[PDB]
Design a protein around this nucleic acid. Structure first.
Ligand SMILES: [Mg+2]
Ligand SMILES: [Mg+2]
Ligand SMILES: [Mg+2]
Ligand SMILES: [Mg+2]
Ligand SMILES: [Mg+2]
Ligand SMILES: [Mg+2]
Ligand SMILES: [Mg+2]
Ligand SMILES: [Mg+2]
Ligand SMILES: [Mg+2]
Ligand SMILES: [Mg+2]
Ligand SMILES: [Mg+2]
Ligand SMILES: [Mg+2]
Ligand SMILES: [Mg+2]
Ligand SMILES: [Mg+2]
Ligand SMILES: [Mg+2]
Ligand SMILES: [Mg+2]
Ligand SMILES: [Mg+2]
Ligand SMILES: [Mg+2]
Ligand SMILES: [Mg+2]
Ligand SMILES: [Mg+2]
Ligand SMILES: [Mg+2]
Ligand SMILES: [Mg+2]
Ligand SMILES: [Mg+2]
Ligand SMILES: [Mg+2]
Ligand SMILES: [Mg+2]
Ligand SMILES: [Mg+2]
Ligand SMILES: [Mg+2]
Lengths: 151, 117, 99
RNA sequence: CUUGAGUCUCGUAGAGGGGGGUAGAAUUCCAGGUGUAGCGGUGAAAUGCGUAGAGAUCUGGAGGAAUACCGGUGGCGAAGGCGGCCCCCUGGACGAAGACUGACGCUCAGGUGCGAAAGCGUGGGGAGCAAACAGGAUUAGAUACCCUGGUAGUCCACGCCGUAAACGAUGUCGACUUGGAGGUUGUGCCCUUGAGGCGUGGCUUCCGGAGCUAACGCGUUAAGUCGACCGCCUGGGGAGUACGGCCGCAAGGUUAAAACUCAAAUGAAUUGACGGGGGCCCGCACAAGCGGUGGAGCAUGUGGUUUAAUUCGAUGCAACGCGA
């Protein structure tokens, strides 16, 4: 991407619900191109999250996701010959992708002797603004605005 | 300890230091802080950040004299004029005018020889 | 000599010939110089000028424009002043001190 | 004889020269007011300065040297050179209109004078600056560069020195030969007149024609076309040295060789190379991502070691599941 900044591809909407962002989610936690397995894990996790929430799976997922969406992050840059650890505000699709990646990673490292179970557990946790994914978003924000000198 | 409420700040902006001193309108000084005396040395001794630090440290030692009206006179085109100016401007002071008063001679004395670096 | 020593000396000389020997009304604002960085070769140098007037680009733009247009004059003055070999090519840049 | 060269008259511009005054900034120092722990310096540091009060700040005083702005791709001078302002003495250049003299001209060996800076002799002065020097550093080394000090000197008077990349690296004088754009300084005439237009001189800067030149370039201020006289050159090194003379208080200057050695030394332009450059601009090169290798066991190749033999070849990327 040096000459022509290339755009993004269009995922087609989710099969069951119809959310393109849920399609991005199932693509994000898919391992070894095994779609159906991750799809089943996501569908099972969303249903489990919905029962405690008493809310539609798409909305509870959305409120949990926005609770993880960062707004500023650190970036290693070189402008004046320095290892500039600049805090910069994030783009919308970038913060969506970062939120999804962070919650997938936290789920994967929780374990809970299952996958759908641990995913639903930490999605319900990030819904109530608590958990390692939320902890890591706050840590990113802290690392970012601990060096406000370069604004 | 007294009240003058209208002073003038001399800013000797050397290439190695920055000396800010607030004085009575008739040359009688009140206090002073230096970029060196603010815990800076070497390069940082002559950096704009240390200049504003010195400006604020000097403002904190004349506030008990009760002034917020200043004219400032800068001398020496050293880095650390902009800095101290905006510092003492951000210290609640009202600056009515800023004046370049560096001593320029009319071919007075021969200057030292240029450094071969 | 070492590029940073020449950088310090050239900062002194540019600041001097910038405070006194200018006549362009486009310049002014107690224009200071934060510093100047030059390559290992002394052929090129970048000056980091810091203006005072309101930081609105209508004026700092004009200041850097005037500096880049007078670069030849400043180079001649520098070459007669500071006694080095090649009279480097100057490039002015707004040092955004407010971050 | 008046066309060359001069004289007179009226004016103009000018850091031209010599002498004497004087002014205003700034550096330093001395004495006070205010005011307290740093100042100074470097790529970093220390030597240095300050608690006896510095530095910074205001006032006053002393002294020396130089004259910001104006300032000029300006001006004057034979060159060297000349820069505040004022007076006194004085040199040259130029213009307008006449009048006068009647070749009185040009060049010039020897000779005479002037001649930056450093230096020399005698006396004075001495703020700043600064060889030498004294320290502090840096560095393999520093007897350099950098830093803190700092004497001669820089300044004045009178003598001496007589040399510079004293350069436009271009001797002086005269005539002739297409242009264009400026600066500066006179001047004539005309328009309603300031303004403006049309001329006509001096000096000066920059492009460029013919021509010239090895080329670069020069080009009406020639390095063009000619004339007059003078200086000077004859391969590089030896050597602007030796010897001798002349000059000088000295330092040295000037005049000026030969033996010997080498087959070149040189000028201008051309194409590239070398950067520990400048960038422009591309590549899964980085970034943004996902998955690995590096740890484990095994497979395989190589190196090594071992062996009677461990056949030979491939060895940075571009050898190592390679020839096989
Ligand atoms: Mg410095
Ligand atoms: Mg005169
Ligand atoms: Mg004295
Ligand atoms: Mg007659
Ligand atoms: Mg002669
Ligand atoms: Mg002399
Ligand atoms: Mg001697
Ligand atoms: Mg003498
Ligand atoms: Mg004497
Ligand atoms: Mg000194
Ligand atoms: Mg000679
Ligand atoms: Mg000369
Ligand atoms: Mg000659
Ligand atoms: Mg002639
Ligand atoms: Mg002349
Ligand atoms: Mg020409
Ligand atoms: Mg001729
Ligand atoms: Mg010739
Ligand atoms: Mg010979
Ligand atoms: Mg001789
Ligand atoms: Mg002799
Ligand atoms: Mg990875
Ligand atoms: Mg392994
Ligand atoms: Mg291993
Ligand atoms: Mg072997
Ligand atoms: Mg083998
Ligand atoms: Mg292979």
């Amino acid at each position: 991407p040096r000459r022509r900044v290339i755009g993004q591809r269009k995922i087609l909407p989710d099969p069951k619900f119809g959310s393109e962002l849920l399609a991005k989610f199932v693509n994000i936690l898919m391992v070894d191109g095994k779609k159906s397995t991750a799809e089943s894990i996501v569908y099972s996790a969303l249903e489990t999250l919905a029962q405690r929430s008493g809310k539609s799976e798409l909305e509870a997922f959305e409120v949990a996701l926005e609770n993880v969406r960062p707004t500023v992050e650190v970036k290693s840059r070189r402008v004046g010959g320095s290892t500039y650890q600049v805090p910069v505000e994030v783009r919308p699709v970038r913060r969506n992708a970062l939120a999804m990646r962070w919650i997938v990673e936290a789920a994967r490292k929780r374990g809970d002797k299952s996958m759908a179970l641990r995913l639903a557990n930490e999605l319900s946790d990030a819904a109530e603004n608590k958990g390692t994914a939320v902890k890591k978003r706050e840590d990113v924000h802290r690392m970012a605005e601990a060096n406000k000198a370069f604004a | 300890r007294k009240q003058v409420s209208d002073g003038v700040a001399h800013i000797h902006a050397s290439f190695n230091n920055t000396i800010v001193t607030i004085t009575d309108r008739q040359g009688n000084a009140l206090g002073w802080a230096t970029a060196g005396g603010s815990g800076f040395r070497g390069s940082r001794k002559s950096t704009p950040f240390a200049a504003q630090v010195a400006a604020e440290r000097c403002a904190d030692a004349v506030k008990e004299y009760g002034i917020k009206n200043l004219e400032v006179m800068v001398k020496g085109p050293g880095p650390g004029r902009e800095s101290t100016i905006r510092a003492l401007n951000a210290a609640g002071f009202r600056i009515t005018n800023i004046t370049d008063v560096t001593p320029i001679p009319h071919n007075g004395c021969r200057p030292p020889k240029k450094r071969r670096v | 000599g070492r590029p940073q020593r020449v950088a310090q000396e050239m900062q002194k000389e540019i600041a001097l010939i910038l405070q006194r020997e200018i006549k362009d009304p486009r310049l002014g604002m107690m224009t200071t110089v934060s510093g100047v960085e030059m390559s290992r070769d002394l052929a090129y140098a970048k000056v980091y000028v810091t203006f005072l007037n309101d930081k609105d680009e209508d004026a700092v733009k004009a200041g850097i424009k005037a500096l880049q247009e007078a670069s030849g004059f400043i180079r001649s003055l520098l070459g007669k002043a500071m006694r080095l070999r090649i009279v480097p090519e100057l490039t002015f840049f707004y040092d955004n001190s407010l971050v």
